[PDB]
Design a protein around this ligand. Structure first.
Ligand code: FES
Ligand SMILES: [Zn+2]
Lengths: 112, 40, 103, 159, 89, 177, 157, 99, 37
């Protein structure tokens, strides 16, 4: 029941129950120390060794099951692509915002 | 100081994150020749 | 008068944003003290050495003993006697002969 | 008494005093006037010395002409080559200052420096706090260093 | 450059500039009666502050205040435009 | 600034005299202000090794006020160093015997627990009432705002101000009052 | 106001009384305090407000005559005691029966005094930091008053 | 060992020294330390705690400009919260964006 | 003036008072009923 969303929940987080996002941005916010051995393994299986380092993962049921076990130790933010997926040409100009948007052009200039 | 505000603006909570302050080159040559890219 | 800080003690603050809004421009001229506010110098009564002698007047017993003398010094400078007491020959020789100088 | 009126009492009003900011329209004219005055000051050589808070390496440096600074790493520069610093968060004079948000434009400020000398740090002792410390479990950390002189800070009337 | 009569020289310079003799006044005062007094003495011309000076005593503050003014006139204030050693020519 | 080096050094590190009035002021708030000035924490050049403290003069220590029942509940303790030499005296009794002690103790308590505290305490000058010696008055360079706003007494209020405050209720004419 | 004049013949004569200010900001306020929108905005230092409910010699007026609701009949009474103990009502001193002089001891300045100074014993054993005993400041009855601070007021010091 | 455990304690004490002197500096102009630092950042001006102490000690006039600027943004922030709805924010309140 | 945890009236004439920080019941008819907390 915890993972069954409510209509008010969608409004607060601004996520549609349909057209779900594909990729999770997962970061480790707390320590694995003092946690049961099984929780330690899941973190290393998911690659969340260094805290405050975002990792890209699939939003699929198998990944979700592991992500739920370490639900309390991480922050999940849906990846967003305002300008679309990066291409070969723009792969070297990518930059991830704190908002969760992977822009394909990084100029370091005023937006104007 | 003031880290939550930087997130609302869409910036990096730490000023030493993604931004012109860090990523831009620290120096150039007097002639204007660009310096070798910083290792970081 | 647009400044939020009174412009009467240190300087006058004028704050403005450039047209683009990418540079903040500040004009801070220095305010001199008003002539009226100043006090006339009292000429009728001088080197600091003379002032020390007047404060540390030798009136009784010629050179006072350390206990009395040091107490007199402590009053003048608002310090304790312990500061004025000497040190031995171990501590004296530890001191650097020529300490480094920056400007 | 009008509806919502609270008789004057200690807890009626907040301790702080509400402030009324100037109307935006007139402020812009004043702001434009302030910028014009400062630009003329720069244009007609009405400054003396200048300081700049240059963000170099990972450290912000308050610098001025004829200054020396120490950089705790190699810089790939030969001895004597003059350098230009591309990040300056503040430039000031006796009577005016210009603040970047967060950096000034290249045209406004050009900071030139020279690589005086390249060296390494004096031996530094690292000895971790651990049982059985011993006198020999000690390593001499030594780092490379470069010394820079801030030759000239120049400004232009492009406000 | 060693000058022992700054106040006397200041009067001479002001006359050369067609400026009246300065008036010395006590701008600030700190712990005068104590053995560590600080006084700020500022020379005033036509009720305008030409310069200010700090001193242990009024005479030293007055004498130093002359030193500040002479620099002003000669433009040796430390905040002067730095010498241009870097001119290619 | 163009000042000479020695006068500049003398000016920067000079020491100031500050006057504080304790009438209807709690000693703690006086202690907070007084202790800060004594250490030199108000100076941007403050350094623990620089001995940059400044003189503070506090007057009207006899007229301080305490919140709540702190007069009869706050107790100061001392020991003479001999058996049975333990004395616990309430604030009211200490203030009656020595008006200046209560203010002095608060400043002593807040100051850092090191050897420099004793040197700082010399700089503190406390007078029970507004009387000040002639030399100190000359020394004074500035005064500091009282931390606690003193509520006005009913008699102090002007007649017009009383009129300004509306009458919440009126007793009936058939009342002794 | 009816007052007795003695001459023996003694006569009580009704005299005109000051009238309350009309047009309260809050119409139909059940309790006089709320009528004037001062429900939770008055404190002990508000001498002008409190004085309107006090007998000439400092005693409290009966609830009926004042009209205040019990909730504001106790809070107002509590604030009055704090004002008297703080010397904010110098003109409402007790009536001296036979010209008796005051105690003549100097008055210690006090404010926000919850209890009578005579009835409070000293706390000789202060207690340690964790177990430290607290000294009362203010009264709990004023909990609901508006607070302009980041965190709630500390009643126990 | 003490020399090694003190190489990483002069970087924390030297910062606490700066906070003492910045707290002293702002207090002269009437601002608490939290207000001074937070507002300066909210104006998008990034100056670390090491230069701010240098500015106060050696450039007192410039620090007054920073104190006034920090104070104005604090006032603007108070006005925005006090005045709800769609209103143009203060001139300094406007935030530049980098893409 | 027996010091007891609970003060209870022993007669109709008994009344309650709060003197010097404690609760007292004093009875005019019978001094026996006088108590303290
Ligand atoms: S104040 Fe309104 S019910 Fe009493
Ligand atoms: Zn009975």
């Amino acid at each position: 029941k915890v993972f069954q969303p409510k209509p008010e929940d969608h409004e607060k987080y601004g996520g549609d129950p349909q057209n779900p996002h594909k990729l999770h941005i997962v970061t480790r916010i707390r320590s694995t120390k003092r946690r049961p051995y099984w929780e330690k393994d899941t973190i290393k299986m998911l690659g969340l060794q260094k805290a405050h380092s975002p990792q890209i993962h699939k939003n699929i049921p198998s990944v979700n099951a592991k992500l739920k076990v370490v639900k309390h130790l991480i922050r999940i933010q849906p990846l967003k692509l305002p300008q679309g997926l990066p291409t070969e040409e723009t792969m070297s100009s990518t930059c991830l915002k704190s908002t969760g948007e992977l822009v394909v052009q990084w100029h370091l200039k005023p937006v104007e | 100081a003031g880290g939550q505000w930087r997130l609302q603006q869409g910036l990096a909570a730490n000023p030493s994150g993604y931004g012109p302050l860090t990523e831009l080159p620290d120096w150039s040559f007097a002639d204007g020749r660009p310096a070798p890219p910083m290792k970081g | 008068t647009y400044s939020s800080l009174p412009d009467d003690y240190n300087c006058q603050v004028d704050l403005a944003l450039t047209a683009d809004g990418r540079t903040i421009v500040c004009y801070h001229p220095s305010v001199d003290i008003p002539y009226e506010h100043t006090k006339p110098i009292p000429q009728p009564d001088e080197t600091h050495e003379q002032i020390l002698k007047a404060k540390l007047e030798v009136r009784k017993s010629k050179q006072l003993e350390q206990g009395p003398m040091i107490e007199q010094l402590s009053k003048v400078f608002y310090t304790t006697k312990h500061r004025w007491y000497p040190h031995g020959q171990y501590h004296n020789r530890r001191k650097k002969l020529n300490p480094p100088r920056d400007r | 008494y009008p509806q919502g009126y609270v008789p004057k009492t200690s807890l009626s009003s907040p301790p702080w005093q509400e402030v009324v900011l100037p109307d935006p329209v007139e402020e812009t004219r004043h702001h434009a006037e302030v910028v014009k005055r400062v630009n003329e000051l720069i244009a007609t050589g009405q400054y003396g010395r200048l300081f700049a808070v240059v963000h170099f390496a990972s450290h912000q440096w308050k610098v001025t002409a004829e200054d020396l600074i120490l950089i705790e790493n190699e810089l790939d520069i030969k001895c004597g080559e003059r350098i230009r610093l591309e990040k300056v968060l503040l430039v000031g004079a006796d009577n005016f200052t210009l603040l970047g948000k967060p950096l000034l434009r290249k045209e406004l400020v050009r900071v030139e420096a020279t690589v005086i000398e390249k060296t390494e740090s004096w031996p530094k002792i690292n000895m971790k706090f651990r049982k059985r410390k011993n006198f020999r479990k000690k390593k001499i950390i030594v780092n490379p260093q470069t010394i820079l002189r801030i030759n000239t800070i120049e400004i232009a009337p492009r406000l | 450059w060693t000058v022992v009569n700054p106040m006397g020289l200041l009067v001479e310079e002001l006359k050369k500039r067609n400026i009246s003799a300065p008036e010395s006044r006590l701008t600030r005062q700190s712990g005068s009666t104590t053995a560590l007094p600080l006084y700020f003495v500022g020379l005033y011309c036509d009720r305008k502050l030409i310069a200010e000076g700090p001193g242990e005593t009024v005479l030293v503050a007055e004498e130093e205040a002359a030193r500040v003014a002479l620099r002003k006139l000669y433009g040796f204030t430390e905040n002067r435009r730095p010498w241009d050693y870097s001119k290619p020519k | 600034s163009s000042f000479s080096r020695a006068p500049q050094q003398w000016a920067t590190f000079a020491r100031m005299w500050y006057l504080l009035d304790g009438k209807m002021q709690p000693p703690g708030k006086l202690a907070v202000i007084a202790s800060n000035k004594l250490q030199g924490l108000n100076k941007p050049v403050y350094h623990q090794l620089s001995d940059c403290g400044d003189h503070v003069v506090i007057i009207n220590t006899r007229h301080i006020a305490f919140s709540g029942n702190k007069w009869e509940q706050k107790v100061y303790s001392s020991h003479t160093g001999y058996p049975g030499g333990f004395r616990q005296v309430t604030a009211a009794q200490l203030h009656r015997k020595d008006p200046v002690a209560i203010v002095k103790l608060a400043i002593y308590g807040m100051l850092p627990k090191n050897l420099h505290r004793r040197t700082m305490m010399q700089r503190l000058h406390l007078f029970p009432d507004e009387d000040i010696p002639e030399d100190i008055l000359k020394n004074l360079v500035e005064e500091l705002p009282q931390p606690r706003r003193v509520p006005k007494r009913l008699d102090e209020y002007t007649q017009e101000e009383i009129e300004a405050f509306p009458r919440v209720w009126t007793p009936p004419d058939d009342f002794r009052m | 106001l009816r007052e007795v004049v003695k001459i023996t013949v003694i006569e009580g004569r009704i005299t005109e009384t000051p009238k309350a200010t009309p047009d309260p900001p809050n119409p139909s306020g059940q309790c006089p305090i709320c009528r004037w929108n001062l429900k939770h905005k008055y404190t002990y230092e508000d001498v002008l407000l409190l004085s309107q409910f006090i007998r000439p010699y400092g005693g409290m007026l009966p609830r009926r005559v004042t009209g205040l609701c019990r909730e504001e009949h106790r809070k107002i009474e509590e604030c009055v005691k704090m004002a008297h103990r703080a010397g904010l009502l110098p003109n409402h001193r007790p009536q001296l029966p036979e010209g008796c002089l005051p105690k003549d001891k100097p008055k210690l300045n006090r404010y926000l005094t919850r209890w009578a100074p005579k009835s409070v014993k000293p706390i000789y054993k202060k207690g340690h930091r964790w177990n430290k005993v607290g000294m009362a400041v203010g009264s709990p009855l004023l909990k609901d008053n508006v607070c302009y601070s980041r965190r709630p007021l500390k009643m126990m010091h | 060992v003490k020399c090694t455990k003190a190489r990483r304690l002069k970087k924390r004490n030297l910062r606490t020294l700066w906070i003492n002197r910045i707290t002293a500096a702002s207090q002269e102009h009437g601002l608490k330390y939290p207000a001074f630092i937070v507002n300066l950042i909210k104006c998008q001006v990034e100056l670390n705690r090491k230069v701010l102490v240098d500015l106060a000690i050696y450039e007192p006039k410039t620090f007054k400009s920073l104190a006034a600027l920090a104070k104005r943004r604090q006032q603007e922030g108070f006005a925005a919260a006090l005045g709800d709805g769609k209103e143009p924010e203060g001139i300094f309140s406007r935030v530049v964006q980098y893409h | 003036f027996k010091t007891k945890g609970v003060i209870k009236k022993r007669c109709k004439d008994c009344y309650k008072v709060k003197r010097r920080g404690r609760w007292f019941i004093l009875c005019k008819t019978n001094p026996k009923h006088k108590q303290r907390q």
